[PDB]
Amino acid sequence: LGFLGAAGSTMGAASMTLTVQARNLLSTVWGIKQLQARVLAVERYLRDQQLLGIWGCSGKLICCTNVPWNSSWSNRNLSEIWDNMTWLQWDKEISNYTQIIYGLLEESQNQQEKNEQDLLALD
Amino acid sequence: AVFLGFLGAAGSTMGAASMTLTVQARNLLSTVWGIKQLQARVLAVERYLRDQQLLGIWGCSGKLICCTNVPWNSSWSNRNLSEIWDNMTWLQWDKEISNYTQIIYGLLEESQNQQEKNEQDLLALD
Amino acid sequence: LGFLGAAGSTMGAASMTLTVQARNLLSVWGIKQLQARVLAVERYLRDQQLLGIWGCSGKLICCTNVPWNSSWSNRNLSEIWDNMTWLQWDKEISNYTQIIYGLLEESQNQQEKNEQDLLALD
Amino acid sequence: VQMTQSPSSLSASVGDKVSITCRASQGIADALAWYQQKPGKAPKLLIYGASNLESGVPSRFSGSGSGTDFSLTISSLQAEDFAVYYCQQRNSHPPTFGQGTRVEVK
Amino acid sequence: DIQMTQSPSSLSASVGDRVTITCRTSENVNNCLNWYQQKPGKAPKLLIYRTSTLQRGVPSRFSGTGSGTDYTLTISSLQSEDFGTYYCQHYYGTPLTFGGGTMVDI
Amino acid sequence: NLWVTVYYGVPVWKDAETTLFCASDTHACVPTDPNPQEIHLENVTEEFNMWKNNMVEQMHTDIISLWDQSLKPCVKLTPLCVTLQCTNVTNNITDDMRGELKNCSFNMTTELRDKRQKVHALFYKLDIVPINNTSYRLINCNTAAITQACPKVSFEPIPIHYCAPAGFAILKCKDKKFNGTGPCPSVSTVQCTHGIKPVVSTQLLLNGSLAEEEVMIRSKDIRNNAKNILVQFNTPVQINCTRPNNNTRKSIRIGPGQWFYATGDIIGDIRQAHCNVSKATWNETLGKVVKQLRKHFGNNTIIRFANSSGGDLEVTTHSFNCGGEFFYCDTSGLFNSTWISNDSITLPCRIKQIINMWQRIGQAMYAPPIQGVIRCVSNITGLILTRDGGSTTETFRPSGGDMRDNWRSELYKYKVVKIEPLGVAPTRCKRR
Amino acid sequence: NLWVTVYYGVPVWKDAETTLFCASDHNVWATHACVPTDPNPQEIHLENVTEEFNMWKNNMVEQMHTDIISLWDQSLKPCVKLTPLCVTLQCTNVTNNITDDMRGELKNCSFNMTTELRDKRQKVHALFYKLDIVPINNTSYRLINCNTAAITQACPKVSFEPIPIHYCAPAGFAILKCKDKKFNGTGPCPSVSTVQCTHGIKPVVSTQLLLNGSLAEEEVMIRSKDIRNNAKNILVQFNTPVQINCTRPNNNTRKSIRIGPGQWFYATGDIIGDIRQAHCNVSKATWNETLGKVVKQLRKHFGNNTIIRFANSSGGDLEVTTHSFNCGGEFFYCDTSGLFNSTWISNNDSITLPCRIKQIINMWQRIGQAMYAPPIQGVIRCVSNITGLILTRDGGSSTTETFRPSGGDMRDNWRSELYKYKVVKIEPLGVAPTRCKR
Ligand SMILES: *[C@@H]1O[C@H](CO)[C@@H](O[C@@H]2O[C@H](CO)[C@@H](O[C@@H]3O[C@H](CO)[C@@H](O)[C@H](O[C@H]4O[C@H](CO)[C@@H](O)[C@H](O)[C@@H]4O)[C@@H]3O)[C@H](O)[C@H]2NC(C)=O)[C@H](O)[C@H]1NC(C)=O
Ligand SMILES: *[C@@H]1O[C@H](CO)[C@@H](O[C@@H]2O[C@H](CO)[C@@H](O[C@@H]3O[C@H](CO)[C@@H](O)[C@H](O[C@H]4O[C@H](CO)[C@@H](O)[C@H](O)[C@@H]4O)[C@@H]3O)[C@H](O)[C@H]2NC(C)=O)[C@H](O)[C@H]1NC(C)=O
Ligand SMILES: *[C@@H]1O[C@H](CO)[C@@H](O[C@@H]2O[C@H](CO)[C@@H](O)[C@H](O)[C@H]2NC(C)=O)[C@H](O)[C@H]1NC(C)=O
Ligand SMILES: *[C@@H]1O[C@H](CO)[C@@H](O)[C@H](O)[C@H]1NC(C)=O
Ligand SMILES: *[C@@H]1O[C@H](CO)[C@@H](O)[C@H](O)[C@H]1NC(C)=O
Ligand SMILES: *[C@@H]1O[C@H](CO)[C@@H](O)[C@H](O)[C@H]1NC(C)=O
Ligand SMILES: *[C@@H]1O[C@H](CO)[C@@H](O)[C@H](O)[C@H]1NC(C)=O
Ligand SMILES: *[C@@H]1O[C@H](CO)[C@@H](O)[C@H](O)[C@H]1NC(C)=O
Ligand SMILES: *[C@@H]1O[C@H](CO)[C@@H](O)[C@H](O)[C@H]1NC(C)=O
Ligand SMILES: *[C@@H]1O[C@H](CO)[C@@H](O)[C@H](O)[C@H]1NC(C)=O
Ligand SMILES: *[C@@H]1O[C@H](CO)[C@@H](O)[C@H](O)[C@H]1NC(C)=O
Ligand SMILES: *[C@@H]1O[C@H](CO)[C@@H](O)[C@H](O)[C@H]1NC(C)=O
Ligand SMILES: *[C@@H]1O[C@H](CO)[C@@H](O)[C@H](O)[C@H]1NC(C)=O
Ligand SMILES: *[C@@H]1O[C@H](CO)[C@@H](O)[C@H](O)[C@H]1NC(C)=O
Ligand SMILES: *[C@@H]1O[C@H](CO)[C@@H](O)[C@H](O)[C@H]1NC(C)=O
Ligand SMILES: *[C@@H]1O[C@H](CO)[C@@H](O)[C@H](O)[C@H]1NC(C)=O
Ligand SMILES: *[C@@H]1O[C@H](CO)[C@@H](O)[C@H](O)[C@H]1NC(C)=O
Ligand SMILES: *[C@@H]1O[C@H](CO)[C@@H](O)[C@H](O)[C@H]1NC(C)=O
Ligand SMILES: *[C@@H]1O[C@H](CO)[C@@H](O)[C@H](O)[C@H]1NC(C)=O
Ligand SMILES: *[C@@H]1O[C@H](CO)[C@@H](O)[C@H](O)[C@H]1NC(C)=O
Ligand SMILES: *[C@@H]1O[C@H](CO)[C@@H](O)[C@H](O)[C@H]1NC(C)=O
Ligand SMILES: *[C@@H]1O[C@H](CO)[C@@H](O)[C@H](O)[C@H]1NC(C)=O
Ligand SMILES: *[C@@H]1O[C@H](CO)[C@@H](O)[C@H](O)[C@H]1NC(C)=O
Ligand SMILES: *[C@@H]1O[C@H](CO)[C@@H](O)[C@H](O)[C@H]1NC(C)=O
Ligand SMILES: *[C@@H]1O[C@H](CO)[C@@H](O)[C@H](O)[C@H]1NC(C)=O
Ligand SMILES: *[C@@H]1O[C@H](CO)[C@@H](O)[C@H](O)[C@H]1NC(C)=O
Ligand SMILES: *[C@@H]1O[C@H](CO)[C@@H](O)[C@H](O)[C@H]1NC(C)=O
Ligand SMILES: *[C@@H]1O[C@H](CO)[C@@H](O)[C@H](O)[C@H]1NC(C)=O
Known part of the structure; x- marks a missing residue:
């Protein structure tokens, strides 16, 4: 389907093409703009990688967490998310709750979890 | 805000400050006038990647707290756990251990992960 | 010993200096250095992205579940690791490098991660 | 940061619209909150973030302002709104409060 | 004004002899001493600045030390080019002052 | 046994020198203003040194660069270095003028x-x-390149916020008694400094920050007679400066769309420019300064104020830009007292159009005339003083001319540090 | 049962063309913009590594040439222009204590x-x-090309003394150095090492004779793109230096004449003392021994019974017909007909080379640009050593070959130093079969 070809696909079907989009995140007048474009692409790629690192998701495109889903973020069932919705619609639905989820992923795992692994690997 | 709480634990003990590792991590990455800005942005990127590369070499990629197989040498610091984790901050620790930091890093590379990965290569072999 | 010191060594002996080469990939006269620094970073990140999408993030030696095809090279291990250098190997299989990369992307991430995604429930 | 709150002696009827304002000695963006204290009672937080209203507080209260200039507007001053109101900044440590505006019944 | 006592006022030495010149100040100058060589008819040549930093172009034969109020200039081997009047100078404040000057003769 | 444990995200930092970027609300700066928010570093005592603060050297370099990039596209007054036939203006001239x-x-x-x-x-x-012979030439027109400032570009200082690159942080000293050096027990981390006005002045510090409690006397070495003393006031002293003449601007075309803006004529009386300060407020302010100086020089020491001993006009007078005109005010009426252990003071002011700012060789700027009558009010927030040195009496005189000492009077509570997110420490946790 | 194993940090590289920067331990080449050098450079021998080198297609030469041009232009850009001097001059002869040659x-x-x-x-x-x-x-004169070229006065404060430039690779790239003492510029190099940066190369600009720089480790090297093609240049690298003592004996003064607001034109003023011709000396024995070595090496390509003749330049631009160089800011054009005048048939004292001096020069043969070299006060003496030659063969196929000095393409001067280096890119990622299964 190529880059963003799954944009109109359901979230489930679109989740099997994650590498297609991942491969396209890195790659006087017209000289300066080219360098700025290169630096911006690198900074945004790394911002996403930094967040994956903080959440304990480094090196993975699909990462499972220890943060439960709060029904106030969305009360839809799985058949109404993965089978009957696209990722653009989902992003529209989860907007006000993105920072809450990110804060919980940062606090509830890879921080408390790493201290717990630090203690478990102690014995 | 991403800036909120940045370095708040700097004066806290090493144990308490170890519970804020994501707060100080999430704020590390983000004409000559234009060139000066590009150099600052590139430098922030280069420093981030050098620290991540060191974590990779030591087998600690993706971790905020990483346990190793390098024994602690009493010649580096002979303090006990109460003195280090409950009665000292990370700035004081860094001042004490900076003379041994390159030795420790050298051991993290030479004394473990190069040997651990070569052994894991042989355990997945059977 | 040293950066590229093992370049003339066999693949086996040369596999012991991966950190020696890896640690030297990140580190008029003003814009040339800025472009050189950006280029070093982009090349580094493209290689790290490939390692990531293959499930090899954070590793210098990474074992996979992709079988070796004798059509890529029919040499035994003795003639690859003990009697060959990495420059010779790179030359010998350059025609198959992208095929291998495609297989690594398909089976070492897309299939493996969905399988792990399912094993975390049952 | 020093906070100056004014007027200190506001009076109004039970049906009037009132506005209580304050000034920061330094700009504080929107890092400001408003509190309500009944005599003999615990202060209640009304507004945080300058413009944000807390759950449990009616839409009757509204905040506005930025930088150094902040205000609290009450669209209809009902009998339960005659209290000492406080202006508080949290932009720089220590937290500081204004002197308070005591709203009186004419 | 900070006064400078330089000793000996006159020193006789031959070629190859080790020569030490002492400058004692009335107040602490915080290692702000300079040494100069003045040949007859010429402006003084700077030898040492900031107590012990050697001026580029001056041979390693000249070395200085000292602290507080007591500073020393040492010539490890007196050569034919090293005869003349040696002065100490302090730059710790104003006025800048010079010592009396020690003449090194044959 | 203990094992090495690697931590990432460690709140550790070392002193560092790095290029800072500017937040604002020019085009060389970042728009949208900085966030004022600061994080208090409880139990962090940090050593500061305002005289070794690299932020001052960058602010100075950047202000000069912005100046040069502001005059570069403006008309260069090269065809004006010609013989002038000058006679005195005798129209409504007062004795002073x-x-x-x-x-x-x-x-x-x-x-x-x-x-x-x-x-x-x-x-x-x-x-x-x-x-x-009546033959005159513009001062230093054959030894320097005189560039006319564009009349549409204002010289009014606008606060510039200095911001750390990511991976760096700016630490602020919150100790109200901080004297410029040494440990600061109350420190906070910020992304950007406060809005610092790029005010250019000598002798008197204008439109700056005030001391939180009492007048501060800051010097690199108070016992070194050759160093400057920065006096930070805890109350402003208001100074009212004016150019009473009603001037006109005469536009003389010199090139293909390039105009020279000359003083045309003066409407009405010609009177000298001057500045007023309240006499009582100034005397109270000096009483506070003397109180603080005696803490270093002795309770029984007589503190004398005197005028500048000499030097460039920029430092013998109080130099400042008032409404686009460059004033050189005689402060001998301000620093004329002996302190033994309402009305106003009027300071005559000279005005110049050819300004050699930063004392560079081969460069000068021509300030176009400002039409009408000029009147600006500034707050004096500090002094730059020097001591005469070599008993029982000390004499202080106005100094300055090095603008770093002005920036330094604002950038004294800040330092830039580099964040060191990696660290190692012993724990009992063992891998595998 | 072999499986694909991914290795990162693999010692593999490929030829690459990238941007190089400089290191150095004011001047025209803006060497203050270079990074500091490594206090202890790490040259790492690549044992059992044989690499193919080709000095004639080496992209480091074109990149260094480009850098020299750009540095030259930004160096002169802020300097005083001399357009007011393109006026009629009234010139007479100088007759004050002038020699018969002057x-x-x-x-x-x-x-x-x-x-x-x-x-x-x-x-x-x-x-x-x-x-x-x-x-x-009728005595009416003008400055050469004053109306067809924009003459820029060089800033007297910007030194023309060559400062070594170390060319450094971006991270992820490496420079390979050829350690084969007999390497002739092309082909396999069995002894290769990898370096962080090149050695310090002085950007010496000269023709015919290569002054200063690297000497051959064992014997004189004859390097050419195609030795059988007489249209190609031959770069001769000496194993022993030949010292050349050049002087501008006149005691000159500098007369600073105001040309603009804070801008001065620097004229030669008057000459103190007498006026003598500039010249260069070389030892006859050292030069003749050096040519004997060059002939012995040329016979390895031309025949052991072939007569090797040296002759002066057949003609061309002054920069090519003479030996062009810069000593202390003065530009010398020395007549080398006394150096390349011999016939070598198979079987103490000195040579004085007359030199002319110019103030208006045009380096890099650019159209519409020229530089005025300001006068240097006093008397100039410089001692340089000759480390090689640029020769051209007459050919024309005879039992005799004739070699003449050549030059004018400064790439050949850089190439004579950047001949043992190549830039490669590192390919740290690779795959290989192992029995290890995930
Ligand atoms: C220290 O701080 C004081 C207090 O702010 C400051 O005084 C102020 O300076 C500004 C700038 O000169 C003054 O504003 C000017 O007022 C005059 C009055 O007529 C106007 O003509 C000016 O307008 C000019 O620029 C406009 C730009 O759009 C043009 O449209 C116009 O035609 C004019 O060219 C300008 O508005 C202000 O009045 C004073 N205020 C007081 C109380 O003095 C002082 O400058 C600061 N000093 C230093 C050294 O930083
Ligand atoms: C090959 O290398 C040799 C050896 O380095 C080189 O010869 C050297 O040239 C320099 C450049 O002129 C000489 O140094 C000069 O000496 C004179 C002596 O009168 C001084 O006056 C000069 O100082 C002036 O210029 C300086 C420029 O930086 C100013 O800083 C200074 O204030 C003066 O204005 C300058 O020091 C040096 O003496 C010779 N060396 C020898 C041994 O002769 C030669 O040029 C190189 N080959 C080529 C073709 O360039
Ligand atoms: C700042 O220092 C105080 C004083 O040591 C720390 O608090 C004390 O120590 C622990 C908590 O760290 C408590 O058990 C004590 O009761 C505290 N006593 C007092 C008097 O505070 C405090 O934790 C530190 N705070 C930070 C943010 O580092
Ligand atoms: C678009 O929707 C149709 C069904 O309406 C579906 O068959 C098709 O796969 C969708 N396109 C993509 C790209 O998913
Ligand atoms: C999910 O919820 C929707 C909305 O009520 C419902 O129509 C649908 O049948 C549900 N599906 C499943 C599998 O529960
Ligand atoms: C966020 O809340 C606003 C109302 O405050 C609402 O309009 C918007 O749809 C919400 N965002 C979502 C549902 O993504
Ligand atoms: C500890 O370090 C010392 C030197 O500091 C060394 O001699 C000793 O062998 C080391 N011991 C261990 C157990 O690492
Ligand atoms: C650690 O050492 C300190 C000495 O400063 C001692 O007082 C304390 O009892 C020790 N604690 C342990 C657990 O060894
Ligand atoms: C580190 O080593 C230096 C000498 O290089 C020494 O002066 C200092 O005291 C040492 N510090 C520690 C904490 O060991
Ligand atoms: C080079 O080859 C020789 C001969 O096989 C071998 O002994 C030596 O170890 C090799 N060295 C390297 C660095 O490859
Ligand atoms: C190996 O590759 C060949 C083509 O190169 C292909 O036809 C064959 O199916 C492959 N076999 C395996 C086991 O991958
Ligand atoms: C692999 O093949 C080669 C043929 O070139 C043979 O000589 C060698 O002995 C073989 N190695 C093993 C381990 O069988
Ligand atoms: C100055 O002189 C000009 C003549 O050049 C005259 O027209 C003008 O009125 C004079 N202005 C004054 C103010 O004297
Ligand atoms: C500033 O305070 C420090 C405190 O250590 C003191 O030593 C120094 O003399 C003071 N300097 C001035 C100028 O007050
Ligand atoms: C200063 O004070 C004098 C008092 O006589 C007054 O005449 C004058 O107008 C004042 N000027 C300013 C600028 O305040
Ligand atoms: C300056 O002007 C203000 C306002 O016009 C006035 O109140 C004050 O008295 C004047 N003098 C001083 C010294 O501020
Ligand atoms: C300083 O005051 C003296 C009188 O004590 C006066 O003669 C001199 O001109 C004044 N200098 C300046 C620069 O004001
Ligand atoms: C200084 O004060 C004296 C009185 O103490 C006065 O006579 C004199 O005029 C004053 N000088 C200046 C320049 O203000
Ligand atoms: C200056 O004089 C002109 C004369 O036309 C008058 O209109 C204007 O109002 C005056 N302005 C001032 C500031 O005195
Ligand atoms: C100076 O400080 C006073 C403090 O009361 C303030 O009101 C005023 O706006 C400030 N600025 C000027 C120009 O007076
Ligand atoms: C000339 O070559 C010799 C080699 O014997 C070297 O010592 C000398 O420094 C060279 N001269 C210059 C100017 O490089
Ligand atoms: C350089 O050496 C190669 C070796 O293969 C040879 O073919 C070539 O002719 C040589 N060229 C010259 C100019 O000696
Ligand atoms: C060259 O040689 C002649 C000998 O005839 C000598 O007099 C002259 O001074 C020499 N000049 C130089 C520059 O070596
Ligand atoms: C050049 O000629 C001028 C007059 O034409 C004369 O004054 C000057 O002395 C001459 N200079 C020389 C060097 O001949
Ligand atoms: C060059 O001059 C030096 C002394 O400055 C002398 O020793 C050397 O022999 C001379 N060389 C030639 C080739 O004349
Ligand atoms: C070359 O030498 C001949 C004499 O053999 C001479 O006539 C001619 O002018 C010389 N040419 C050059 C360029 O030196
Ligand atoms: C060349 O050498 C001959 C002697 O073999 C001599 O007569 C002639 O003058 C020389 N020519 C030049 C240009 O040096
Ligand atoms: C040039 O002549 C002047 C005459 O005063 C003399 O002082 C100077 O030393 C001479 N310079 C040289 C290099 O001969």
């Missing part, structure tokens, strides 16, 4: 490159020098 | 130029070299 302004005639090239025209302009005495 | 070489030229004020003019004088002046038609 006789000889200060001259009516100078000259032959200027018109828009046609093959034609000349006779024009005239008024110049201040300080801007012209004799040739030998 | 007759007509230096002209005392008067002209009307503005002074401190824009309206006031003065009659001013300068002594110009004959080569910098072209007749207008």
